[PDB]
C-alpha cells in the first residue's frame, strides 16, 4: 500500500523532471555572452556603527532607507540613523537570544524573536514616548527564524518547526498555517507586491506560498544542502537562494527551474545572506570567510569584494532606495558601504 | 535653518543618553557569566536545574559572581542551526546518563560534534557524568550492559592517579574512569581551537555541583586571560 504511494510519488517526480527538461530551451549564461560586463565595483565603507556589544544576527533597513534597526545577543534593539550615525532608540528585550528583527513598512512597529519561541512587537509611536511591547505572538513550537511585516496589521513569520504562519496583530492568533516543509524554515522573503513569498528550509528546497489562499504552488529542489538566505529579484518573478554549498542560484517562477549558478572554485564556506541591487544586476552575498562578495547576476563573474569584517557577515541589506549597503557581522559592527566614482 | 540645527542637537542628546545607558549595561554584561545547560535526554537536567516556553533562565549568584543557566528544552530535536547561537557563552555544561538505545553512544556523538563545530571550537565544555549510584547498582547486580556494548572495556585497567573512592566497588570505579577516558580522549583528539573539557562525577546531591561549576568557570576565565596576555 505505502509502496504504491511511493511509486506514484516517484512517477510524478519523474514527470516533473521531464517537463522541466522539455521546457529547458536555452541557457542564461549562453545568452548573456554579449552583454557589457559590469566591471570592478569600488565600495568604501562610509559609516561604522559601534553601539552594539555582542554579535549581530539581523538588521532591517527602514521604509525611507534612513533608519535601520539591528538586533544583538546582548538583548538590545538599537534603531540607528544612518546619515548622522546617531541612535534613535534602544530597546531592552526580555530574552537575550534573538535571531531576527523586522522594521514595519509604516515605520510604526518593530518585530523581534528568537529562541524564546515568541514574536514580540514594539510600537515606536506612543503618547508616553515609551517603546513598550504592543503584542506578543505565541503558538510556535520551535525557535523563531525570520519574521517579515506583510503590513501594519499582519505579519508572516517562520519558526524552527516545519511551519510558517500568517498572524494578525489585532487579535493575536494565527490566520493561516503554511505546512509542508521538512526541515527548519531558515529564511523567508515577501514579494514586492506582497502577493507571494518563499520559505527556504533546511531540506534543500524552497516553496512558494500565496498568502490569501494558503497553499504551496511550486517547489525548487536545485540546492544540495541547507538554505540560509533567500531574496526575490526586484522584478518579482525570480529569486536567489544562498546555501552551505558556497553557491547561490537563480530560480524563476514562470520557468519553474534554475537559470544559472554563482559557484566559485575558491569559495568553500557557506552563505549567510543574499540580496539584490535596486536594478537587479548586482548580487551581493555574505559569506562565512568574513568577506561579502558582489556577483554579476547575469554572468556569474565576481565584480567586487566587500572585505573588512573580522567575523562572519550574518546580515546583508540593500536600501529600499538602493543607495547604501549595510553589513553587520558577528564582531558587532554595522558598516554602511556605498559606491563612488 | 535653525530647525535643522535644533533637530540635530536633540538627536545628539538622545544619542548621548542612549550611549550612557549602553555604557551602564556593558559592565553588567561583561561581569555576568553565561552557561548553556545542554544535556542529552533525561539525564538529570531537571534536578541539576533545581539544585542550581522554549527557553528557561535562572539568575543565581554564587560567591559574589552572577550566572545564567540556559536550559533549552522545548526546542526541536535538531540542533545544528540554533546551537551556533551559543558560541559566545563561557561554558557548555554537558550532562550524561552514565548508567532505549545506547545512550552513551548518543552522548559521545553529540559531544564530539559540539567539540568539532567550527563556531563552537572556541567554547569550553563541562561534563557531568550523572547516575553514579545507578551505575554502581547496575555493576554490582551482575548486569552485562557496558561490558558488551563496549568491547574495548574488557582490556582496561583503573588509572592509578585518580582513585578517591573510600570503599566503592573497584569495578564501578573502573567503569566510571572508562567513561571519563572515553569522553576525554574524544576531547583531546583534536586541538584545532582554544577550548578545554572538565569532566566531573555528579554523585553528591549537596551544593557541591555549584562549587564545581564556579571553580571550572574561574579556571576558564583565568585561562582565557592568560592566553590573551600570551603568557600561557
Amino acid at each position: 500500500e505505502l509502496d504504491q504511494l511511493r511509486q506514484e510519488a516517484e512517477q510524478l517526480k519523474n514527470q516533473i523532471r521531464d517537463a522541466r527538461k522539455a521546457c529547458a530551451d536555452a541557457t542564461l549564461s549562453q545568452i548573456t555572452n554579449n552583454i557589457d560586463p559590469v566591471g570592478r565595483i569600488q565600495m568604501r565603507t562610509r559609516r561604522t556603527l559601534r553601539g552594539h556589544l555582542a554579535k549581530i544576527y539581523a538588521m532591517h533597513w527602514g521604509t525611507d532607507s534612513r533608519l535601520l534597526v539591528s538586533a544583538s545577543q546582548d538583548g538590545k534593539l538599537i534603531i540607528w540613523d544612518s546619515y548622522t550615525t546617531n541612535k534613535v532608540h534602544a530597546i531592552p528585550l526580555r530574552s537575550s537570544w534573538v535571531m531576527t528583527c523586522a522594521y514595519a513598512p509604516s515605520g510604526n512597529y518593530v518585530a523581534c524573536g528568537g529562541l524564546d519561541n515568541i514574536c514580540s512587537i514594539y510600537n515606536l509611536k506612543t503618547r508616553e514616548g515609551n517603546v513598550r511591547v504592543s503584542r506578543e505572538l505565541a503558538g510556535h513550537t520551535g525557535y523563531l527564524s525570520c519574521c517579515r511585516f506583510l503590513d501594519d496589521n499582519q505579519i508572516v513569520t517562520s519558526s524552527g518547526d516545519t511551519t510558517c504562519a500568517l498572524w494578525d496583530i489585532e487579535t493575536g492568533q494565527q490566520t493561516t498555517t503554511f505546512t509542508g516543509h521538512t526541515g527548519d524554515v531558515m529564511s523567508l522573503s515577501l514579494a514586492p507586491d506582497t502577493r507571494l513569498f518563499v520559505s527556504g528550509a533546511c531540506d534543500a528546497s524552497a516553496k512558494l506560498w500565496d498568502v490569501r489562499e494558503g497553499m504551496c504552488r511550486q517547489t525548487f529542489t536545485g540546492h544540495e544542502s541547507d538554505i540560509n538566505a533567500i531574496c526575490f529579484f526586484p522584478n518579482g518573478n525570480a529569486f536567489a537562494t544562498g546555501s552551505d554549498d558556497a553557491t547561490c542560484r537563480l530560480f524563476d517562477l514562470r520557468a519553474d527551474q534554475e537559470l544559472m549558478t554563482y559557484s566559485h572554485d575558491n569559495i568553500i564556506c557557506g552563505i549567510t545572506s543574499v540580496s539584490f541591487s535596486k536594478s537587479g544586476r548586482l548580487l551581493l552575498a555574505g559569506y562565512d570567510d568574513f568577506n561579502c562578495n558582489v556577483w554579476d547576476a547575469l554572468k556569474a563573474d565576481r565584480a567586487g569584494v566587500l572585505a573588512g569584517h573580522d567575523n562572519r557577515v550574518s546580515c546583508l541589506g540593500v536600501t529600499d532606495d538602493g543607495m547604501a549597503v549595510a553589513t553587520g557581522s558577528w564582531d558587532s559592527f554595522l558598516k554602511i558601504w556605498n559606491g563612488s566614482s | 535653518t535653525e530647525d535643522q540645527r535644533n533637530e540635530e542637537k536633540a538627536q545628539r542628546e538622545a544619542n548621548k543618553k542612549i550611549e550612557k545607558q549602553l555604557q551602564k549595561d556593558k559592565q553588567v554584561y561583561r561581569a555576568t557569566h553565561r552557561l548553556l545547560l545542554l544535556g542529552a535526554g533525561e539525564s538529570g537536567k531537571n534536578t541539576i536545574v533545581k539544585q542550581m516556553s522554549g527557553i528557561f533562565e535562572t539568575k543565581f549568584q554564587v560567591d559574589k559572581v552572577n550566572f545564567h543557566m540556559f536550559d533549552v528544552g522545548a526546542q526541536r530535536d535538531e540542533r545544528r542551526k540554533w546551537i551556533q547561537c551559543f558560541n559566545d557563552v563561557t561554558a557548555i555544561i554537558f550532562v550524561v546518563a552514565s548508567s532505549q538505545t545506547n545512550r552513551l553512544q548518543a552522548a559521545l556523538k553529540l559531544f564530539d560534534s559540539i567539540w568539532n563545530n567550527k563556531w563552537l571550537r572556541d567554547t569550553s565544555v563541562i561534563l557531568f557524568l550523572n547516575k553514579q549510584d545507578l551505575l554502581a547498582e547496575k555493576v554490582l547486580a551482575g548486569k552485562s550492559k557496558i561490558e558488551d556494548y563496549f568491547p574495548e572495556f574488557a582490556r582496561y585497567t583503573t588509572p592509578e592517579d585518580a582513585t578517591p573512592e573510600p570503599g566503592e566497588d573497584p569495578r564501578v570505579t573502573r567503569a566510571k574512569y572508562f567513561i571519563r577516558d572515553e569522553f576525554l580522549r574524544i576531547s583531546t583528539a583534536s586541538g584545532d581551537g582554544r577550548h578545554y573539557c572538565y569532566p566531573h562525577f555528579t554523585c553528591a546531591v549537596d551544593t557541591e555541583n555549584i562549587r564545581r561549576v564556579f571553580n571550572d568557570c574561574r579556571d576558564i576565565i583565568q585561562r582565557m586571560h592568560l592566553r590573551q596576555y600570551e603568557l600561557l
Partner: nanobody
Amino acid sequence: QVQLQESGGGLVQPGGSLRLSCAASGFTFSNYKMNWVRQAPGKGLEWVSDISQSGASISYTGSVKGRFTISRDNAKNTLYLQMNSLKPEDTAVYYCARCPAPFTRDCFDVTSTTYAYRGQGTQVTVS
C-alpha cells in the same frame, strides 16, 4: 533531491553475511561524510558507522567493530557496508544518512527522526 536509495536487505540465518549498498545521485558525493544509521523495530534510531570525505577516518558504534566494514567509491557515487557474522539482535531498518554540510568534520542531526538527508528503509531480518 539528494535521492539516497539503498539496496540489499532481506532475511538471513544467524551468523550469515549481507551486503548493503547506498546509491546517491543528487550531490557531490566526495565532499560529504556519509554515515550509516539503523533503527531497531521497537527502539529508536542508532548510529552505527561513518566514513570520512576521502575514506580515511572510519569509526564504529561498538558491538559492530570488527564485524561491519564500511567503504565508499567516489567515482561510482556509491557507499557500501559489508556486514558479517550477524546476530538476531542485529535486525533493524538501516538508513544511509548523510552529514548536512560539506567540508566539515562534524555533523549533528544524523540520528534524528525528522532528518531530511537520509534514505528510505532497507529491512534486514535475522531468524
